[PDB]
Amino acid sequence: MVLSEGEWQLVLHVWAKVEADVAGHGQDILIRLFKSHPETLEKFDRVKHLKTEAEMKASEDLKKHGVTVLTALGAILKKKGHHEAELKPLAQSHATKHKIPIKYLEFISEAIIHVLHSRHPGNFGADAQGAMNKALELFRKDIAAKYKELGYQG
Ligand code: HEM
Numbered sequence: 001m002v003l004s005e006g007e008w009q010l011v012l013h014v015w016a017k018v019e020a021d022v023a024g025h026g027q028d029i030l031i032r033l034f035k036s037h038p039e040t041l042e043k044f045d046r047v048k049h050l051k052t053e054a055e056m057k058a059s060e061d062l063k064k065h066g067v068t069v070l071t072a073l074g075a076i077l078k079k080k081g082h083h084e085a086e087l088k089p090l091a092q093s094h095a096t097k098h099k100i101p102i103k104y105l106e107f108i109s110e111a112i113i114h115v116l117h118s119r120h121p122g123n124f125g126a127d128a129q130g131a132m133n134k135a136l137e138l139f140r141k142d143i144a145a146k147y148k149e150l151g152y153q154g
Contacts, residue, residue, distance in 0.1 A: 001134065001137065001138050001141065002081065003080070003081060003131065003134055003135060003138065005080075006131075007130075007131035007134060007135070008080045008081075008131075008135075010127060010128040010131040010132070011077060011128075011131050011132055011135045012077065012078065012080075013123060013128070014116055014120050014123045014124055014128055014132065015074060015077055015078075017119075017120050017123055018070070018074075018116070018120075019074065022066075022067055022070050022071065022074075023063055023066065023067050025066070025070060025115060025119070026063065026065070026066020026067045026068075026069060026070045027056075027057065027062065027063055027066050028115045028118075028119070029066060029069070029070070029108070029111050029112055029115050030056075030062055030065060030066045030069070030111075031053060031056045031057070031062075032111040032114055032115055033107060033108050033111040034050075034056065035053065036107065036110070036111065037104075037107045040104055040107060040108075043098060043099075043100060043104075044065065046061040046062075046065070047059060047061050047062050047065070050062070069108075072086075072090060073139075076139060077135060081138065083139075083142070084142075087142055087143060087146060088146065090143070091143050091146035091147060091150060092146075092150060094143075095146070095147045095150045095151075095152035095154065096150060096151075096152060099152075099154065100154070101154040102140065102143070102144050102147065102153075102154060105139075105140050105143060106140065109133075109136040109137075109139075109140065112132075112136065113129060113132060113133065113136075116129075116132065117129065
């Protein structure tokens with residue numbers, strides 16, 4: 001699948017807003033993920049034991065993870081589809097070290113979309129959301145292909 005330049009512009013335009021507060025958005029997203037799909041919290045050894053949203057908000061490790069996710073994703077989105085190099089080490093660690101099924105990447109995509117909608121309503125109308133969904137689908141499709149090469153496809 002291929003995004004048009006106009007769809008990339010919509011994606012990179014909200015993303016410039018996200019980057020004003022990387023740590024805050026990373027928290028919101030990972031908390032949304034863990035509340036909506038608690039099975040995902042089990043994958044994170046530093047943070048599995050957290051019981052409430054208040055504990056989550058307080059956690060420095062959760063905040064570090066959030067910043068790590070959003071910084072890596074940002075770097076991918078700014079490639080506008082030319083992201084083969086960036087994807088290789090990410091696919092390898094998530095397939096063979098962490099063991100993250102594709103389904104979980106769908107869940108975090110849903111969390112990203114929810115949080116951008118809440119925090120950026122003026123820059124995240126229907127066409128911008130469509131374009132973000134297309135960019136994240138492209139990311140997932142390319143990761144799934146790499147999982148398969150690596151021997152996992154989960
Ligand atoms: C937008 C998608 C995602 C991005 C860009 C991303 C990126 C990263 C990065 C850059 C790291 C550190 C380097 C590495 O281990 O490769 C990491 C670690 C990790 N990721 Fe992700 N990730 C994503 C989604 C997920 C999801 C959905 C899960 C689990 C439900 C997950 C679980 C983990 C775990 C367990 C670690 C290791 C954390 C630790 O240090 O204990 N990732 N991820």
